[PDB]
Structure formats: structure tokens, C-alpha cells
Subunit: 322 residues, 6 copies
């Protein structure tokens, strides 16, 4: 229905999530989709993969740090998926200003080009790290989320609607723990662990993709979407993983804790739970500037983690192994 | 006249509550110069006519957003105080990119110019807002804190030293509740109350001033100094204000929460408490070094969530000349 | 009448004249007024002073184009009131004065054209005429910026007018509040050169002059109000007299660097073009517009330099607008 | 030996030539090697590849379009390997301004920042495609080569040294024809072939890696080193690539004519004729001195104008290195 | 005809080709023509030279490195001629980042500004140096040429058209060999010869002017127009120049000093790569190369100045005389 | 003497005064002179003129709106002549912000790059148009002059010292009245006159060259040098010109005032006469942050006669 005959930009289209959004949107036969990123090699690989489907896809090389390039990329465009970002906790500690240029300054650049190019809607892909952040990456997402909600509230005349979406661990994404364990087994027969008492809300690629695309379609403006998500144990994941890659003399090595890392991650602040709504599969938090959700602390701490066996089925079902 | 005697000092943000206090404390120690750096000529004027006889000061108008101006402001300077910021919570939610500019991009400029001009020590003035933040201001100050942390790691060949200092509410500061409620009664016999069940760590002007001067004096880089503080309930504050300002059929309006406001504040994260040192009056969180008789902290949480009494708060206000 | 349900932006609205314009404009029931200034403490206090009375508050620096651009989003009328106004400060920090007064004034013009703003009224000074200091040179360059924009408009409909004041009595960081608070505290007064003279004006006078140009102007004009001349000599005695309610030190501080001994309403060369209303001079751009009640002005100088108002008149002025 | 307890930056250290240069420098026990790349996920892989050798390495995220970030990466550094670029002919024609930012504007940021941080040497990693180019990519290298010679000539009093090295096809390097053909056979069983009569000068990874390190150690500044490389027909390569990839996995496989991509050259050249008139020869190398020991013969050094290798030597070469 | 009552910007109208375009565009009687140049003294001369014709002409001081100023010069303008550049081979090798700013970064500013102001068409003025170049100058012109084609390809929904023209040595144009040799002969009685064996494609000022103006009128967008031009030997040129400059000022026994090549100089020039000659169209007096990114077909082969017969000495002399290239 | 074995940059060295400084400086046999300007064409002409003296001279293309280029141009330089500017009254009126970039914003660039490259002295070339200015150009030189002073006053630790020099009309300079009339007579026989009742202090090319080079050699910092100049009548100039070029049916056209123009020019404000010093052929105005000058207004409001003028012109 929704995207048929429209002009879409996907900023970060070579990344785990951008590629997933591309091909679902492509099924609605859109007039065009434009993939925006910095790295030619990754666009090269993208081009090849879409060999015979490539008529209605276009590949811009650009950096979201550069305004005039965001702007040109945003010409005659209806929908902007803003999915570019520095996502690694450690990299955004060792390089904390670099994290700012991409996540914060890049966001203002995206916002501002969307106002000027009279874009219809913009969907910002945030994280549960933005809640009560222990690290610079999360600080930059909390700032970016403030940037997006401000944009909506001070629009003025603009017809451009601004929205956020909020992820937890997208399972098996670029640089994530699941591929790194799968690799470290096969090659080294040694796993690299931080702290097995750690906790995370996690979610499938499609879960993350559908949230985002549903957001484009339903988004009113100034709101945040948070999917209802299962908690996963880092102990459970390590054992379930070491087992399933074998198809069992692996040495679990304890490396410690990467700078900034949070022991647990939270879907929303308690203060947000006070104004937040509850749908079947998802929460909606309206702009700070129709069913009520239960007030409280939605931590991964507080949730019964799914059991080793329920987790095992989840990995093998979504096929996160090469 | 020990440490600063005949040295060259830059107070960036020196026109303001805390910058002015540092200015007069540092000045007793007989420094060779103190450069006061600030954007607004009205404030430089006012402060300049306050010191008409106290010769030792240069007054530089400029903006920490402009690196070039920060760079020349640091020329031949021994000790920088980075006190400039946007400090209201509400203003950083409604003008959130403006906050990034002053609080983040501005803090880089300090770090980059200090390195380039071979400054001896830089001291950043942060908030307990930067712990487990609920608002853009808090996040910007956490990011700034990490900029200061990283700058100390990446130093390289540089001798320049980067330190943070972390405050809670400096009682009676520019744009704060104690002046507000006072002047709201005076004029409109009305109080604007947000949520009376809020709690804050709060401190005196002198407390924050000496904390910042102490860290400047003894820091080798990487640390974060926190003075331990009385906890203050807003419910008691409202009452004690209505009582003492009258000297009492005064309206109490409930504006409600301003956006992004946090119900309590926190001196440090749980992970920080794991490496924290304890002193009698203070905490020192080191970087990922010995201090005169400091035990290791009690790990755990440091939330304002138990408050000082109403007659204590009365005294604290009255003895401070806050009215 | 004029501002009813229209959209207004006051660049520099926290300040002496900014606030004065703000609330005059608000009386005409305008759809919104956006206040634009940098300093959050000042927006805060003003926010509290308009706690019932429709007003967006934006933090921004005119040195940043992008911020000024979004400030003018969908706006009809703009008041460009922000500058550095101290003479001493613009000599001691001269490049900072270029940034706010010149570069910043571009950003307004450029952004107003960009967002198709209906009218812009620039607040200038007597200082811009035959200037002896950087500030006045910045205001001269501002003025020519504004005139040029109006000429090279092209297809644009944005109109650019200048307004040109003299000392707005009791404005932020000026001598009347200074001397008052100098006596009260120090029993001392800082006097520069007592044979100085100034055209000076009321806060409301300068407010109405600026609201006039908004309503009336077709672009290119520089409006100057006719103004009483005031001796500093007389001001200093009158001040020492009224603030006491006995013996008070009068310190010779001397000239602050760059200061002019007298001020001028227009250049001689402008008097050859100038129009004359009863209480106003309008200088049309060099480039045949009709104003009502207007005859041609008389060629010559318009210096303050002999015909100063009396102490009697002056103390009456200072006492009547409650300036203490 | 040379790099012992030195500080080294590899601008572009994550990709093919950067990684190979890194591990070769590491065997001489330098104090530190820094690695400068934009993409955190490529640094994440490299960082994991050097699991327990890492104490010597630092990982810097940054862009050479950013002077300030290039500058801080150069702090107290002795040796710079400028290896970052857009290197794809197609991408550089469809995004030519991007190519200008990284290949030219970055090269100057490098020059300017090395001068400012008092680096010893900078080796610029250019292509033979900058000679009589038919594309933007080549034009950026020509310009970049021309920036490197200009820095040297007007050094003034800088001790910093500037040199270029000039590769032809580095076999198997990220996003090039050999891994594409293997992959195209594996997944689809089609090879995609532009124009089969194209010829290319091709070198191995270590031929390149050691060209750049030699240059690093030996250069007197303003020079250009190029390695004598064998020619390879694309006729032979495509044939050889199917033969061998089919063997490894399971040769009745399609060949699809694509024709040229925009700006693709038919052959490449190591130096223009003019360069050939003042270049020096060593057994395995040519050295062009600055435009601003044994001397070569003139002529047209092209892939055109030199006998290729045989199918068999080509296959042999491919086997001793890069399949998957 | 075409420019009747239109608005025109000649970015670089103070120079040789920009002035000639100005006066040619002026006879079709447009609403306004704007001149955009950095140098006030050059504008001052032009101003004074157009004593009574100045009324539909405006004089905008400005720099194409400045986007914002390129922007406002283009306001509500219909036809942009981008004729500004550093065009000296030697200068662009010794100041190559300056060449980048003026020749590349400035071309982008034009492109970006022209799209933003909804201009109708733009004609970029390239050189035949862009073909298989041996210098930074020709490096930047290839790149500029490339920016122009890219603009067109991804226009998007912009109606703004982009086209390149492509010149050879424009005779008597500012800072060129002919006024140099004349003046050298006058003032030091000896010329400076790089390398007499060099050959060059050379066109008249009117050939250059008409080429550009035609491409303004005709161009669909993304094409490249090149004029069939005669080859000139520098041997003949140096000889002819000494003869005729002597005949005038009344002096032919004057020194000839071999300087050798300046850095980056090419021996011959080329109108197009061989590759381009396989898609290019021939007209009587002109080739049209279409866009490489998206009616008579020309012959293939290498169109060089060493690969085509010069004019004779005597034809050259006729030319140099009839073009009034002496003073 | 003073410039032997030194490294001199001349910013704007292709134009009237810039060149005059180049060749005088060259007699003192410096190690190097760098000529810095925007225009390749003008450098080209300058390279040809100096063809057999050019080992000493370097030729940089750069715009003083661009810091990094001014900076690199300043590498290892001892003395900087800041002679580049937008100088026409009219061009600075129609193009007012362009004039700010070059005159004001350019000057900050020189100053800031001078401090960084530890340049020994910097001499700024201003105009008496800066006094009580009627035009934007005047506004921008008064602002520039201030910048230079402010740079000296807040140096801090730098050894770089900043100095200004104030010209009136440099006779026969680029784009000026005398070359315009000489050309206008021969080709058209119309002179184009603004207001014949105008007034100007005027000075020889040498005068201004020597003022500037002296300021290099002597200057302590923060001072302005003004040379004692003769006043010339635009009536006397227009006739003297027509007579000598014709050497007289040459019609005179009154075009009127171009925008911004001042009827007279002034060596200093009254306010500066209160602090200025006098010398044989010069005034010295010290930093607002030796013989006293007589106070009063140094307006061009006695002129030199028709005959003294004619001698001045024919003597060059
Ligand atoms: N002449 C030839 O033989 C020849 C052959 C092939 C191609 N071309 C091309 O033809 C074009 C014109 O050649 P031409 O012979 O007429 O050159 P020219 O006489 O030097 O003209 C150059 C023009 O551009 C202006 N300019 C230079 N830099 C500028 C900047 N940054 N911003 C704005 N304006 C600038 C110049 O005036 P100011 O210096 O006053 O700013 C002048 O108006 C050039 O693009 C060149 O590449 C020429
Ligand atoms: N002539 C007088 O009567 C007089 C009177 C008062 C003051 N002055 C002052 O004396 C100085 C020189 O006057 P002049 O007669 O020599 O003028 P001029 O002949 O026009 O010389 C101007 C010089 O500055 C260069 N230039 C212009 N803009 C530039 C920029 N953005 N970046 C770098 N270089 C630039 C010019 O180079 P190009 O080759 O690029 O054009 C040229 O070399 C100026 O500061 C002027 O204001 C002169």
C-alpha cells in the first residue's frame, strides 16, 4: 500500500537495519529508493547483490556530517529513514567527539535538510541506551532524541513530521556478540566474555524492521516507539552459543568490561512510564513539549529472562549461523 | 598567596555566579593576571565597575563556540577554569542543539586550545546531572565529561592535564529557585511549584568555589571530584521560603514538572562507586594515585532519595545571606 | 491595528529596547512574537515577567546563520535590535564587534530574503555618522549593508529599513544607572570629560520610532527622531543632586578610548537629501517616495554642540520617567 | 631496524594496503602504530584480529576531510602513511565531489597537518591511473600527486618530507575483479565482463606493501617510486578465474558482456612520455624526481606496449595467493 | 532573438571570453546582464569602457569560492555562463590547491547555486587540456567537466540544464603567447621559446564566443560541444610573430632563447579521448559528445594536434593580422 | 641596510604600492621576497618584468580571505607588508560585504597568522578616509586600524609588533583619477568630473613607499604614521591635466558624486591632534589603549596652485 510510487531515502542503507528496510520497502514497488552511506566498498557489495533488481535503487556516496550532501540526497523525497550512526559503546568512549559529529551533529543535519526539502516524514532509529545512559554513545542518542522531539515542536509551518523508534539488541547485527562468538569458536576455540551476569532486551531483525516501517506509516509526530521485548541472559547466551556452534572443549576467557558498558538496559525511564501508552506489541511515549501503561522501572534486571531452551530455538529459527 | 602567586589564570565564564567567586578567591593569592572570558558586555561592564580598584584583570568578550577566540584567550596562560555552559534544564530541552554547541562543541574547543597553547591544568565544572541523566543538559555534560576523560588518555606528548569537578545545586545561583520564590512572593504573592516530592543535593557558593579551586591545586589528570552534600527536600524549601520571605496568605500554584526534570540527583553511577575513593568531605573518582588519608568508598547507589531538617534548612538559608 | 494576528520576531528582545518593543507590539494582539537572544538567565527572568501574557523564547546567536534562518520561519516582521553597543568594548574587543554588528547583520539580511520576510527594521546610532570609533564604523557598515540589500533585492519583496537613535536614557549599562549606583555604593562618580554633549531620548520615544518605521517604511529609509541635547556637566550635577535624596567625590577618569565629544543625526551630505516631518528626519536612499507632512530639510550639520537643555528641564526629564 | 621505537600513523590502515603495511611495520618493533579509518566496524574486526598483539596499536576513528582530527592523530608522530581514498573508478564519476573531498581535500589536510605537527615523512599512495587519465579518480590522483610535489618545493623551513608511490592493480584488494569473479561464479554462475581486450599492470600485496615501506625509508622527498610490474590480459584472467574457481567447488558457466563502465581506461601507464625523459632506473623500480645514478630509456610505458604474461604464469600467480 | 528580455550572469565577465560574450549577449537586448569578477580595477576599466551602453549591465564584485555570493548573484537569473578559472598551466602546478578552489570547488558552488535559484541553463567553459592531461590544470578541468555531467544526471526534478563547451588556445586572450612575444620583441628584443616542436589547436575569440553562446541556446544538457579547429605549429608562430612585430615597430634580428618546457606542459593537445570519439556526433563545424552517464556519428580515432596538418606559415600570418592581435 | 638577508612577504605586491615596496626592498638584497596576490594574470606580468632578477622573488597565488593560505604564505617570514585591499569608494558601496571580507576580515587573518608564524613586524597600509568616514570603505579602514591597534595592545607574549600607516591619494596609482583623465582625453575628448570644488591631500608614489618602509624600520607598535601632504584642488587638477595631455576643445561632463564620496579628506580627527606628535615631514599617533602636535582639524578644507601642481605631475 503505503510506499507504492513514493520516493524514499534510506540513510545508512548498507548497514544491518538499512538493508532490511530497503528490501521490505522494495516490495511496495516504490518509485525510487536511495541508499546513502560513506563507504564505496559496501555500496559495491550492495550493487552486486541487487544485480537484476537495481533499476529503482540509486546509490549516493555521502557523509551525514556534510549538510549540502544530505540536502542533495534529500531532493524531491517523501520519506527519510535515518539509520546512520556510530553504534558501538567502546568506540564512542575512545572517540567521543567523533560520536558527537555522527550521532548528534549528523542528526541536526538530517533534520534541517528534511525541513528545507519539504520531506513528508522522518524516522529516527534510537536505542534503549538513551535511557539513563552510563556512556557517551547513550548520551548522544538521548541528545538526538531531544533533537528530534524539538524539531517537531518548533516545526512552525513545516509539514515535515519527526518521529523516533527505540531498539535493543538487533540479533546478529554488524559487530554484535552472536557473530563474534560464532567466529571465535570456529577459529580460536576460545570465547571472549565481559560479565556473565549482564542482561539485555533483544529483538529480531524483522522485529526491528517492522517497528521502523510501521512508525513511518502510523507516526503522528514527536513520539517514540519501543517494542515489547524479551530479556536474555549473557550466561544463557554463551552456553546456548557454545553448544550450537559445535554442530565442546571451548575455553571461556573473561576479559572484563568495555569502557562505559551498562550491566542492564531499560525500555523507558520511570518518568516516561508515567506518560507512556501501551499497545499489544509495543509502547508509545508522546512528546514531552489510547490505553495507559503501568508506571515502573522497565529494566532487563527486573524481567524474567527467557530460558536457555527458549533462547536456543530463537537463534536456530532466525538462522544467525553462516 | 601560595599556588596562584604570580601565575596566569583564565576563568572562562567568569562573569557568572561561580566564575565570579573563583575570580575573587584566586585574586587573593596575588596572581600575575586573571583573564575573565564571557559573551555579554553588560555583565562584563557591571563586574568591571565592581573591581574598579582591585588592576590585575583583563576582560575578554568572546564565545567558547569560537575556537579562535578561545585559542587567543588561552595565550600564555597557566591555569584554565572552564565554567561556561547553558545550565537550565528547560532551556536545553527547548533549545537542544544550542546546548550541544555551548556544552559539547564548546568544551572541545577548550580542550583543543588548551593542548595547543600548552596550558598546565584545565578544570571542567560538571553536574551530578551527568549521572543517569533524564534530559539533554545531563547528557551534554556526560558527553563533555567523556571529552575530558578522553583528552587525558589521548594527551600523548602533551603536559596539559584535564580534570572534572561535579556539583549539585549551588544555592542562590543565577536563575535558581531561591531567588525565584523570593521575587515571586515580593511581586505576585505566588509560588510556582513543580513537584514538591523532588529532592536535591545542594551546596553553598563557597563550597563549590573551594572544591573547584582544590581540584585545580592537587589534580594530576583524569579524576572527578565530588563534595558530599546535604540533601534538601523541595517541600521543606517551599515552606521555609514562604515563612522567612514574608518576614503569609500566599498562593501555591502547581505549574507541574518542567520537561526533562529528574526527581532526585546522583553523585556518581554504580560502576563509579566501585573505584571511588572516600575523603572526609569529598569523593575522588580516578580514571581507568594516592590522596592524603582516603579510605575506599562504600560501593552502591548515591541517590538524594535522607533530607536535612526544616530548621536546619532555615538556618542554612538565613546564615548564607541568600535573601 | 497593524500587528493583529501577524508573526513578529524580535532579535535582541531580552534587552532594554527589545522588551519595550515586545510589549508595545503585544498590545496589538499579534499571532505570535518570537524573542531571540543568547543568554538563558535573561530569557528566564523575562519568561517570569510574562507569565500570563503567545510568546516563543528562542536562544540563538546572530553570528550563526542557521539559527537565525529557523528563527525567521514563516515570519512577517523582524526587529533587528541585537548588537554590541558599548564604545569602550568594541575598541577593546574589536573583532567581536565585527562578528555581532557586521557579520551578524548579514546573516539577518540573507536569512530574511531566504524566508521571504515582509519587512526588516534595523536599529542604528547617531554614532554611525562621522565616527571616531569601531562601534560607529560597524554601525555605518551595517547601514550600508541594509541600503545595498534594498537596492539589489531583485525579485525579493523583503523591505529593509534603518532607524537611528541617540542615547536611550537609562538603558542597560548606561551612565544614568551607573552614576546612581556609583553614589549609593561608593559616594564617588566616574566622570570622563564634562564638556561632552549628547542627543538623548526616552525608552518609549525610541520604541515608537522603531514601530513607526515598521508600519510606514518602504525600504532604504533611515528614520531619525529630533532630540533634546544634554550636557554631561549638567547631567553629573543633576545626578549628584537627585541621588542623594551631600558631599560626593567627582573623579576625572578621562576619555574612554574612542569616545566622541558630541554626536551627529546625519552627515552634511545626507542633509542635502533629507526630508522633514515635525518631530522626525527621514533620509531616503540615494536610489521619489512620498511621506506625509514632509518638507525638505535644511543643509548643514546636525551636531549636539550652546543649546543644551537646562538642569531644570533635565531633572524634570530624569524624575518623570522613573529612571531611579 | 628503521621503525624501531618510532610513532607511526597509517591513514587508511583498515583496508587492504593499510593492514599489510601495519603488520610489516609491527615486525620492526615501533613504539606505537596508529590506525585512522572512519568505519568502526572495520576497526572492530582489525581490533579483534590483533587480539593478543595489540599493546603496540592504537585505533583512531576519524575522517581525512576533518583537519582537526587528522591533526590530533599526527601528534608527536614520525611517519605518515596516507593510504585512505576513494579508489573505484565508477564511484568517483557518479560521486565526483565526494572523490574531491577525500582524494584532494584530504591530501591537503594531510600535508598541512604534517607540516604543523613536524612529522618526518609522508608517503602518498597514488595510482598509475593518474597518468593521462580518462576519469575523475585519475584526475584526483594527478592533482594529489601535484599537491605532494608542491608541499615539498615550498616546505620553506619544514623538515617534513613528501613522497609518492604509484601502484597498479593490487591483486585481491578489497572490491576488485578477482574476488568479484570468484563470488559471481559461486552464487550466480555468471561472470560479468566489461571489455575483454583491456590490459592492466598488476602487483601483489607485498610488492605494494614493500614499495611503500622502501619509499618510506629511502625517499629524499619530491620523488615518485613505481615498481616494474607484469601486464595481465583480462581475456586470460577471466578464463583462468573460471577454470580455477570451478575446480575448487564443482565450467559450463556464463560470461556476460557489460561493456565499459564510465571513465574506464583501456590500458594503464606507469609514466607519461615526459616523465620517461628524466626518470631513473633501478633493477626493480623507476624513480621520477621532482618536476619543480642510472637514467631510464624514453618511450611509452603502457600495458598496451609491453608483452603480457602467459595464462599459466597468471594462474600460478593467482594460486599462490588469493582464492577463498 | 534568444536573450530578448532575459536575465544573464557571466561569471568571469571581466576576462577575454567573458567580455566578448557580454557584448554579443548585449545585442540581443536582454533585461539585464550581470558581470561577476573578483577584481574592482578590472570591473572599473570595463565600467568605463561601457560609458553609454551601461544600463542593462550590473557589476557584482565576488568570488566563486564563496557559495553565498554566487547564490545572490544568481537570484532570479535565467542563463549562467561559468567562464571564471585559473587557466595557466604553470601557475596551477605551483599553486595547485588554489587551482582546486577556483576550478573544482567553485564549479560546485555554481552547480549547487544554479539548482537552488532554479536557473534555466549553465554553460561550463572547459579546455581541451582535460583530455588525458599532464597537468593539475587539466586535472581540474576533467574534474569540473565531471561535476557538470553529474549535476545533470542527478538533477532529480530540477529543470536546470548543464552543458560543457571545450576550447583550444584562444588567440590574443589575456596572458597568452601572442601578446607576450609581441611585447617581449618590443621591450627586450628577444622571445622566450619553450619548445618549437609543440603544436596546438587554436581558435578565434569569436569562434570561442559563438561556440559558447550556441551551446547556451541549443543544448539539451550533459553534452560537450567542441569546435573543429586548425592546428598551429609553434615553430611557424615564433617565426611569424618576429617578422610582423618587427615590420610594424620597425626593428628581424632579435634573439630566440630556449627555455624548455614549463612543468606539466603537454606537447600537443586533443579534442577528445579515443573512447569519446566512438559516441561523438559530427556537425559541419562542431562535434557533440553526449553524456557518458546516461544525427551524424563521427569517425573514431585520435584527434590530436600532432596528428593533423598545420595551417601554413602564411595562413597563420593572415590570421594573426586579420584578428588584430598586434597593438 | 635593514632588510639584507631577511625574509619578506608582501601581501598585495602586484598593485601600485605593493610593487613599489618590492623593488625598493630588493635594493637592500633580502634573502627572499614573496609576492602574494589573487590574480595569476597580474603575477604573470610581474614575473616577466623581473625575468632576470627572479631568484630573489617567489610568487604565491592566495586570497587574504583564506587563513591557511595567508598562514603558509607567512612561514619563516621576518617582515609583512599588508598592502592588499579593496580601495575604491564606489565598489565598496555597491559591494559592501565584499569590502568587509577583504578589508576587515582579511586583516584579522593577517594579524592572527602573523602571531602564529612569529613574524617580527607587520605594517598595515590605511587611508585618511578612515577619519570621520562618510563611506563604507572608510568604515572598513577605521575598523582595520582598530584591529591592528587591538592586536598590539593584547599581544601577550608575542614578539610580533603591529603598525599602521595612513595615505592620501597616491598619484597615478591603479584606477585613479589621473590615469583615467589621460585615457579619457586621447580617446573621447570628454573628461568625466564629479564635483570640481572637491579637495584631496595627495602624495607621490615614492612618498607612500618611503613612509611604509620607514614604518617597518622604526615602529615600536600600536602607532599610526601620517605623512605631511599637499592639498590639491580638483578644478586645478582638471585644467592642468587637459593642458598637459593636449600638449583644448576637450569637453567637461559633470557626472556628479559617486556613492559615499567625501568632499574633503582629513589626516586625523581633532581628537587625535590632541595626542599626536609632530616631526619634520610626518605625524605620529600613538596607541589609544618627541614634539607635541598643534591641536585642531587637519581637513583638506590653502591648496597648491595650478603651477606647483603641473610641476608635480610632469616631475613624474
Ligand atoms: N584563453 C584560452 O586560451 C582558453 C583555452 C581553453 C579554455 N579556456 C577557458 O576559458 C575560460 C575563460 O578564459 P579567459 O581567457 O577569458 O580567461 P581570463 O581572461 O583570465 O578570464 C578569467 C575571468 O574569471 C575571473 N576570475 C578568476 N578567478 C575568479 C574567482 N575565484 N571568482 C570569480 N571570478 C574569477 C577573472 O576576473 P578577476 O581576475 O578580476 O576576478 C576574469 O573575469 C576559463 O574557464 C578557461 O579555463 C581558455
Ligand atoms: N592609491 C591610493 O591613493 C591609496 C590611498 C589610501 C590608501 N591606500 C591603500 O594602499 C593599499 C594598496 O593600494 P594600491 O594603490 O597598491 O591598490 P592596488 O594597486 O589595487 O593593489 C591591490 C593589491 O592587493 C591585492 N588584492 C586585492 N584583493 C585581495 C585579496 N582578497 N587577497 C589578496 N590580495 C588581494 C591585489 O592583487 P590582484 O592582483 O589580485 O588584484 C593587488 O596586488 C591598500 O591597502 C589601499 O587601501 C591607497
Amino acid at each position: 500500500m503505503f510506499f507504492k510510487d513514493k520516493n524514499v531515502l534510506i540513510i545508512g542503507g548498507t548497514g544491518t537495519i538499512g538493508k532490511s528496510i530497503l528490501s521490505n520497502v522494495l516490495q511496495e514497488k516504490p518509485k525510487v529508493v536511495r541508499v546513502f552511506s560513506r563507504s564505496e566498498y559496501n555500496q559495491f557489495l550492495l550493487q552486486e547483490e541487487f544485480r537484476d533488481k537495481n533499476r529503482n535503487i540509486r546509490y549516493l556516496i555521502g557523509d551525514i556530517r556534510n549538510y549540502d550532501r544530505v540536502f542533495s540526497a534529500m531532493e524531491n523525497i517523501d520519506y527519510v529513514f535515518h539509520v546512520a550512526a556510530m553504534k558501538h559503546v567502546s568506540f564512542c568512549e575512545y572517540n567521543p567527539f567523533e560520536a558527537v559529529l555522527t550521532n548528534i551533529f549528523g542528526t541536526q543535519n538530517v533534520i534541517k535538510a528534511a525541513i528545507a526539502q519539504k520531506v513528508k516524514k522522518v524516522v529516527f532509529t534510537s536505542s534503549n541506551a538513551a535511557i539513563s545512559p552510563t556512556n557517551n554513545y547513550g548520551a548522544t542518542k538521548l541528545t538526538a532524541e531531544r533533537l528530534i522531539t524539538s524539531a517537531e515542536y518548533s516545526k512552525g509551518s513545516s509539514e515535515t513530521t519527526f518521529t523516533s523508534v527505540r531498539f535493543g539488541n538487533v540479533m546478529g547485527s554488524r559487530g554484535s556478540v552472536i557473530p563474534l562468538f560464532e567466529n571465535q569458536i570456529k577459529e580460536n576455540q576460545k570465547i571472549t566474555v565481559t560479565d556473565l551476569s549482564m542482561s539485555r532486551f533483544m529483538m529480531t531483525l524483522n522485529q526491528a524492521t517492522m517497528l521502523t516501517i510501521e512508525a513511518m506509516k502510523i507516526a503522528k509526530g514527536g513520539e517514540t516507539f519501543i517494542l515489547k521485548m524479551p530479556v536474555i541472559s549473557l550466561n544463557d547466551l554463551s552456553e546456548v552459543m557454545i553448544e550450537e556452534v559445535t554442530k565442546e572443549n571451548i575455553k571461556i576467557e573473561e576479559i572484563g568490561l568495555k569502557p562505559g558498558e551498562k550491566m542492564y538496559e531499560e525500555l523507558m525511564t520511570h518518568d516516561e512510564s508515567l506518560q507512556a501508552f501501551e499497545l499489544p506489541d509495543m509502547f508509545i511515549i508522546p512528546s514531552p513539549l489510547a490505553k495507559r501503561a503501568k508506571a515502573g522501572f522497565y529494566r532487563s534486571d527486573n524481567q524474567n529472562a527467557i530460558s536457555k531452551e527458549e533462547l536456543r530455538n530463537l537463534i536456530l529459527n532466525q538462522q544467525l549461523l553462516t
